[PDB]
């Protein structure tokens with residue numbers, strides 16, 4: 001493993017802890033959610049993110065954050081606001097962007113000196 005892969009795996013593990021039922025663990029299929037592919041053109045999930053860390057597909061934390069935001073935005077686009085999926089996506093997006101905030105990333109960058 002590389003230092004970037006270890007940092008991204010840490011962020012991913014802490015994010016997955018916020019989803020204990022594993023609603024974001026695997027891609028959303030049309031069988032579980034009718035007409036999903038008709039609405040969501042750029043799907044994302046924690047598993048695909050985990051595969052991208054392992055394959056070393058992320059060049060920066062910004063790219064990782066963009067995939068995390070895409071996953072949450074997709075759930076908020078497809079699901080109505082009073083649903084379990086929309087509420088969880090909104091909660092985790094907020095929590096994730098605090099964890100990987102510019103403030104927290106600057107403190108980590110300063111500790112790499």
Ligand SMILES: Cc1cc(-c2ccc(C(N)=O)cc2)cn(C)c1=O
Nearest residue numbers: 022023024028032033075078079085
């Ligand atoms: C619409 C939607 C459905 C799901 C979902 C994932 C797994 C399962 C299951 N129990 O197998 C059921 C529902 C997840 N997400 C993120 C969504 O937007």
